[PDB]
């Protein structure tokens, strides 16, 4: 039977146009006073997942 897309992935990741896997930086969901504005500012950016693990997540999404 056909694979099911992992919804848990679908919902926190996007595969790019060139095939990289992009996600939100972790580290600012709370405990955020006392964090620099440098920290926060940067954690607001989408980043590219190391290749080893990008490939796995790419197989959870067979229909993107």
């Amino acid at each position: 039977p056909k694979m099911k897309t992992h919804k848990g992935a679908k919902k926190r990741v996007k595969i790019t146009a060139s095939g990289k896997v992009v996600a939100m930086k972790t580290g600012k969901r709370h405990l955020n006073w006392q964090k620099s504005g440098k920290e926060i500012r940067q954690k607001g950016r989408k980043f590219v997942l190391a290749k080893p693990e990008a490939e796995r997540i790419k197989l959870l999404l067979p229909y993107e």
């Binding site: 992992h6 926190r12 996600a23 796995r56 959870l60």
Partner: protein, 147 residues
């Protein structure tokens, strides 16, 4: 050319890898599975599973709108096609005539887009980007805009 000639090219058909069938083979005994432990056993999802540690995926946080019941909202959708793709046509271009050509997918409102050379062509489209509009209204194209 009779039946005895019909033959597939080199490597068009290739042998299977039959394991567990004697020492000389390769490939014997353990059957390319090494010694002991689940993976050698008959039978866990390695795209996700990571050993009881919190997975690489489940530590990433969620983004944006997931949608809720009763689910997705019907709004119109726009597919772009590029001026360059409009190249092969003469006279008038519709969405209809774009689909039946395989450029504009069905149930998609048509939006002309920038990339390519404006052809002096009547192009009937649900939407035009800026540099698409200018380009056309400058090669003498006729940008009819419908709804």
């Amino acid at each position: 050319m009779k039946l005895s000639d019909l033959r597939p090219n080199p490597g068009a058909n290739k042998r299977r890898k039959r394991v567990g069938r004697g020492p000389g083979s390769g490939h014997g005994k353990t059957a390319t599975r090494g010694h002991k432990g689940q993976k050698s056993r008959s039978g866990k999802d390695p795209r996700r599973f990571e050993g009881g540690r919190s997975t690489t995926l489940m530590r990433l946080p969620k983004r944006g709108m997931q949608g809720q019941v009763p689910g997705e909202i019907k709004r119109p959708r726009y597919q772009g096609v590029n001026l360059k793709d409009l190249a092969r046509f003469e006279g008038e271009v519709t969405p209809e005539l774009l689909v039946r050509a395989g450029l504009l997918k069905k149930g998609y409102r048509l939006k002309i887009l920038g990339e390519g050379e404006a052809k002096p062509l009547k192009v009937v489209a649900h939407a035009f980007s800026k540099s698409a509009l200018e380009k056309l209204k400058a090669a003498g194209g006729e940008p009819v805009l419908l709804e």
